[PDB]
């Protein structure tokens, strides 16, 4: 060890040469996965190649709660609100997640509308050729019965445009920094203040 250099911390003291993972098959893996998708698309024809419908869910933690993404499946409460029995949903390309809770009305309503939109543009072939049962389409099995490639109800961000407002004297007098400091102070003294209030009751 010599000169001014960062302190080395190479983790190469084990038998690492026996655990090297090369990627020379990376082009081959791309080929195999594409072949699998192409084969799968023909098997499920005319069902969409994108797979089952997924719900809209928020990102977890404070770092990602401002964005939305695809979840596992629609909750039981969402399915009931949309009037789709849970046992029928997976058979018509709707993912079902019996574990997911609904803590807010906004989240519940967002996915309920998504289900209704999906049902609007859903064509269901009858189980048997001639006789037609409830829920099946008529005269639409040939008009626009094609396999859709790619997403059909994409989950995307809708960034609002900058809005120009009129500054009122009420907003100009608002002390944003003072509000933050007061709110922080009340949070870290909540326990102490509640303690003395309780102790006051005992004395009184």
């Amino acid at each position: 060890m010599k000169h001014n250099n960062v302190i080395p911390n190479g983790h190469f003291k084990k038998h690492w040469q026996n655990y090297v993972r090369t990627w020379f098959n990376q082009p081959a893996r791309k080929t195999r996965r594409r072949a699998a998708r192409q084969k799968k698309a023909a098997t499920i024809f005319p069902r969409p190649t994108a797979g089952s419908l997924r719900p809209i869910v928020h990102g977890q933690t404070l770092k990602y709660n401002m964005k939305v993404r695809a979840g596992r499946g629609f909750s039981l409460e969402e399915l009931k609100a949309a009037g789709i029995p849970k046992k029928l949903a997976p058979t018509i390309g709707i993912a079902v997640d019996h574990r997911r809770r609904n803590r807010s009305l906004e989240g519940l309503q967002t996915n309920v509308q998504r289900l209704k939109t999906y049902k609007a543009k859903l064509v269901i072939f009858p189980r048997r050729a001639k006789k037609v049962k409830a829920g099946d389409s008529s005269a639409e099995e040939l008009a626009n019965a094609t396999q859709v490639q790619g997403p059909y109800l994409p989950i995307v961000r809708d960034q609002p445009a900058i809005e120009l407002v009129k500054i009122t004297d009420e907003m100009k007098s608002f002390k944003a920094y003072g509000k933050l400091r007061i709110e922080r102070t009340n949070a870290r003294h909540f326990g102490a203040r509640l303690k003395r209030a309780a102790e006051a009751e005992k004395e009184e």
Partner: protein, 147 residues
Amino acid sequence: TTRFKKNRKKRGHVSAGHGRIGKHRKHPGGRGNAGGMHHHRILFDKYHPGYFGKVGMRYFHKLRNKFYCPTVNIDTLWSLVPQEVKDKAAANKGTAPLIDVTQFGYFKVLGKGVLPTGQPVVVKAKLISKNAEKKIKENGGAVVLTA
């Protein structure tokens, strides 16, 4: 690139540039960070002050998402507005643009630099420094808090 390696220039020179006296032995000073306190003491103290010892409190299972707080300065706030919206701001002085920094991946607004002259702005952010709020107010703007 082998043909540019200096070992090639040293072919036929016996010692390969490592000297006749000292030679190139295996590990004549120990491996890696050996002897940081004994025979490499000067090196560590001269170039790596603070290397040895313990400071501060431990934090078991520390998650970085809880501490996420990207910051944007006053001088950079105007650059977030689209160019087409900048023209509108200068076309009507009665209203002011609403810059919601959270929509651009920022939580707190710091107060480095100055705002454009004669342009009030309404800044919407989770947090803000006192200097940042003062500069926004003295320019005719206002601050709105969100979460």
